[PDB]
Chains A and B, each alone.
Chain A
Amino acid sequence: XVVXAX
């Protein structure tokens, strides 16, 4: 997998 606040 996850990639957290683009």
Chain B
Amino acid sequence: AATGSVTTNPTSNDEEYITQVTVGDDTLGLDFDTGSADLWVFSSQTPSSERSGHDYYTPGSSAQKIDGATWSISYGDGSSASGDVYKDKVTVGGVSYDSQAVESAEKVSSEFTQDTANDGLLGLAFSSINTVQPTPQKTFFDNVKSSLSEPIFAVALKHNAPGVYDFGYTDSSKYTGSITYTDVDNSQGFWGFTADGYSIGSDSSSDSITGIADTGTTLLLLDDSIVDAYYEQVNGASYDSSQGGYVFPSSASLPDFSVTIGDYTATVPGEYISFADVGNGQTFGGIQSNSGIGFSIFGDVFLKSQYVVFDASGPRLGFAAQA
């Protein structure tokens, strides 16, 4: 069709979101990642010890291997995967493309093999950063956008509940008010943008924040000055070297965190900042430092409170409060 929708479900602690997709004759759970442009899956070529417990892709009669083509990717958390390439039909909630480049994994790192629900990733960043060699391939979105009613996809990730990915249209029953747009900087292949300011509780700052919208990143990673300022308002909070981040008494009161985009205020409920248990009655925070990255990453912790529209016509990004 010219439009389509599909359910996406979080894994424990909302660490990542999984979406069922049909690759060839196989239905797999993939992590939709706007932070990368490679669609790769666990397959019959993946060593048995590494694909144990995962559903996988087996090239069928509709598959055609791209001779001499290879891919290799490294992610921000150090994880990785590599293999060869096939072209096959891929269907996402009714929307299909018969010649999508499917990257078959021959090697996959431990971060991926342990989480049995994750059978690969579907990249939604700009195709300019696809890693296939010698010739780069296009993302599923770039291949189908011309056939969609509108060249866009929107996402409504939810906290410990079913959410949705919309293709070709915006679902007015998923958000309230109107959508506010901001320009996108895709010079580095990502959905980069700049927020006009932020607020810790009611303390608002005119300071600007530049970063990327990444469905494939768990937390909200920002500059140390903002991170430190946030936890100064959280009694009992302190940096824990063993866990690699700020933690605080599970009973502590957490202030809301907001980012200003134009005349719109995107607010992250303090309750969502309580990310995970770390023992001793303490909780690991949903907001941590972007140290090293070089820029901020608006991950799931942030995205799960908004209905976000990724518009390729601009490129532009749209935000609205979830309904």
Contacts and interface: CB of A to CB of B under 8 A. Distances in A.
Interface of A: 2-6
B210 to A, nearest CB: 15
B214 interface: yes
Contact of A3 (B37, B121, B297): B297
Interface in B167-225: 189, 214-218, 221
Question: 8 tightest A-B contacts by CB?
Answer: A4-B216, A6-B76, A4-B33, A3-B76, A4-B35, A5-B36, A3-B77, A3-B217
A5 B122 CA distance: 12
Nearest to B125: A5
Interface centre among A2, A4, A5, A6 (most CB of B within 10 A): A4
Contacts, number: 51
A4 B36 contact: yes
Nearest to B74: A5
B222 to A, nearest CB: 13
A3 B33 CA distance: 10
B67 interface: no
Nearest to A3: B76
A6 B293 contact: yes
A4 B76 CA distance: 6
Nearest to B77: A3
Contacts of A4: 16, 31, 33-36, 75, 121, 214-217
Interface in B63-86: 73-77, 79
A5 B38 contact: yes
7 contacts: A2-B111, A4-B31, A4-B34, A4-B121, A5-B38, A5-B131, A6-B76
A4 to B, nearest CB: 1
A6 B292 contact: yes
Nearest to B189: A5
Contacts of B216: 2-4
Given A5-B75, A5-B123, A5-B129, 13 more contacts: A2-B75, A2-B77, A2-B79, A2-B216, A3-B35, A3-B75, A3-B216, A3-B218, A3-B299, A4-B34, A4-B36, A5-B37, A5-B125
